[PDB]
């Protein structure tokens, strides 16, 4: 008899890594063709994004099945650990098989391999269930539809870390000046070759800041959560799926625009991605408020001390993104500056959120 | 006042991702030049490996400093969370700055940037300490050199997951057949194009199996650990550093050998990597046995029930690697088959380890 906490943490890390594999082809796509071939590049980008979304949803369904499986199975052991490793190895083949099926939809080998992988996952899970039932001491006490908050938190942390570190990984792997180019194309100057990669550094800064603030909101929310429901799970899944598109948005934004309208369009896309990623968390919070009596702590109830604080912490990014989208639509001249000032201020607001909330409450107090 | 468990888990995930960034250039190096340029490719590979080792050690020192910092700081808050995000962002620049300094050792800008990043990390940590001391309620009770087992476990899990998923990530990103090549170079056959990528699938299978079994040994060990020391931390750091070289070893092994001696050499390299990765864990276990009274549970003491079991679970891989190295040295004809049979059996031994241990104890019993 052994504790299964670390095994489930490792499984969550593996699944979070496997769910964000189809987002690398997205971030590795050309920022622009520079040869008036925008149509084909956008076609391929949209196809890759759809494939990423579908693979993420499938891996999340698998992760939920795993969480239920190990919720009915309390304690683990050596054999159960090896079977869980086998299940993870089987799940690792879902993205490849799905991409193969969607790329060759005419030949039946792709769907065959996909169904084979699914049946293998199911068979491993059934073997785990059988081993757990043959040894009743490996079952939960209640055995001898709320999700597990620990698994949700671990999955979200892994996804956020990967999405925040994608760009720095790409930089460290690829954007390192080489002596030849440094002293040939930049006239013997390292500072020039480093400044040439300024846009990527700024994109990484912005993506990391945004992802970290979203994770901060998520962590402040789930600190007052008692029972995670399946609707909250779906909403968090959608939020995490739309969070993987922040690196691409920032890459496009930091890229030099061929025409002034492309800058506005890219800012709109980035603001929409952020708005979705944050409004899904806000929807999770509202669905929790629906049954706060059995979903949230008394501190964030209707009338608590940290209720308005959490409201604002979760509605800051959606409101800012909506205002930026409007400025892009209505003003259309000061949109980039507004977006940059939002990027620079939202962190400051998160830091001084309590003072601003108090000031606003005092403003509504005597008015 | 908020719990800092999830914040430290996120920090550990980020640091584990940042520590394994310099291993991607290693796995992305050409398996062979095929033009009799082995010398230059091996030079670059060794340089990349040394850079990876140094960056891993530096990031591990930073992670240890962070663990001590948040061991003296018990509880966290919003400001502390934002400062920890800033510290992580600063640490994320250590690999890039170190590679820049080691690539341009003549110009002082690289070492300048490295020292600037180090001083920024130090300043963020000092600000965290000051904020924690100005608010005594954020300090540990003992405040108002054993490491923290949770941080070690999380870091190890992240490293193992990344090292196990590197190859499947590369496959899903790169080794997906395209219709044009499929129906042009393979004469209209998808199964042929898929079998053409068989070596990479086998390499991923082997790497995942080995990394998962090493993680299984680590998880069985740290389940009986009470107090992790700094020597055990150094040994685990070395083990994790040498674990990142398993993907490259398996890539080289699965690659077709130009001459029969290159196969033996690659098998020797793989066996040596595995031997180091496992013997460092064995050394950690022995250093724990040294002070078991305050480092291990009574179950794995000298004379316990699970003592020999853990001995064998930790000494299985080193002994197998040593036997394979010998076979490469002495036999030199059946070395590849022996290595493959070890790869296929070590999992079976882990599964049936208790029965084999009992059989061996009965063999020493009546003999
Ligand atoms: Cs966790
Ligand atoms: Cs993780
Ligand atoms: Cs990655
Ligand atoms: Cs953890
Ligand atoms: Cs991790
Ligand atoms: Cs990762
Ligand atoms: Cs990776």
UniProtKB/Swiss-Prot annotation, chains A, B:
The gene is TMEM175. A motif (RxxxFSD motif 2) lies at residues 151-157. The record marks 162 as: Hydrophobic filter residue 1-2. A motif (RxxxFSD motif 1) lies at residues 6-12. This is Endosomal/lysosomal proton channel TMEM175. Changing residue 229 to A: Reduced channel activation, probably caused by decreased interaction with AKT1. The chain crosses the membrane at residues 5-27, 49-71, 78-99, 110-131, 149-173, 201-223, 230-251, 267-287, 308-331, 334-360. InterPro entries: TMEM175-like. One of its GO terms (molecular function) is potassium ion leak channel activity. Changing residue 16 to T: Decreased selectivity for potassium ion. It is linked to Parkinson disease: A complex neurodegenerative disorder characterized by bradykinesia, resting tremor, muscular rigidity and postural instability. Additional features are characteristic postural abnormalities, dysautonomia, dystonic cramps, and dementia. The pathology of Parkinson disease involves the loss of dopaminergic neurons in the substantia nigra and the presence of Lewy bodies (intraneuronal accumulations of aggregated proteins), in surviving neurons in various areas of the brain. GO terms for biological process: lysosomal lumen pH elevation; neuron cellular homeostasis; phagosome-lysosome fusion; potassium ion transmembrane transport; proton transmembrane transport; regulation of lysosomal lumen pH. The record marks 17 as: Hydrophobic filter residue 1-1. Changing residue 17 to M: Abolished proton and potassium channel activity. It comes from Homo sapiens. Residues 29-34 are annotated as: Short helix H1-1. Residues 36-42 are annotated as: Short helix H2-1.
């Amino acid at each position: 008899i052994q504790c299964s906490q670390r095994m489930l943490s490792f499984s969550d890390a593996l699944l979070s890594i496997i769910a964000t594999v189809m987002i690398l082809p997205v971030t590795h796509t050309e920022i622009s063709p520079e040869q008036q071939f925008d149509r084909s590049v956008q076609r391929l980008l949209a196809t890759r994004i759809a494939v990423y979304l579908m693979t993420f949803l499938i891996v999340t369904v698998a992760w939920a099945a795993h969480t239920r499986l190990f919720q009915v199975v309390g304690k683990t052991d050596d054999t159960l650990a090896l079977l869980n490793l086998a299940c993870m190895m089987t799940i690792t083949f879902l993205p490849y098989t799905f991409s193969l099926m969607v790329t060759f939809p005419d030949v039946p080998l792709g769907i065959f391999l996909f169904c084979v992988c699914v049946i293998a996952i199911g068979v491993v899970q059934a073997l785990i269930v059988g081993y757990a039932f043959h040894f009743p001491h490996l079952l939960s006490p209640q055995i001898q539809e709320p999700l597990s908050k620990e698994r949700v938190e671990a999955f979200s942390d892994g996804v956020y870390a990967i999405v925040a570190t994608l760009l720095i990984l790409d930089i460290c792997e690829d954007n390192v000046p080489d002596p030849k180019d440094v002293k040939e194309r930049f006239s013997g100057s390292l500072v020039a070759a480093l400044s040439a990669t300024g846009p990527r550094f700024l994109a990484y800064f912005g993506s990391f800041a945004t992802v970290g603030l979203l994770w901060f909101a998520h962590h402040s929310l789930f600190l007052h959560v008692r029972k995670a429901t399946r609707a909250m799970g779906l909403l968090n899944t959608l939020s995490l799926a739309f969070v993987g598109g922040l690196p691409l948005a920032y890459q496009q934004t930091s890229a030099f625009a061929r025409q002034p309208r492309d800058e506005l369009e890219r800012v709109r896309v980035s603001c929409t991605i952020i708005f979705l990623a944050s409004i899904f968390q806000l929807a999770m919070w509202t669905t929790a408020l629906l049954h706060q009596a059995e979903t949230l702590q008394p501190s964030v109830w209707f009338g608590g001390r940290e209720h308005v604080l959490m409201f604002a912490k979760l509605a800051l990014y959606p409101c800012a993104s909506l205002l930026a989208f409007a400025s892009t639509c209505l003003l259309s001249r000061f949109s980039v500056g507004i977006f940059h000032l939002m990027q620079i201020a939202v962190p400051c607001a998160f830091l001084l959120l309590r003072l601003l909330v108090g000031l606003a409450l005092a403003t509504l107090r005597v008015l």
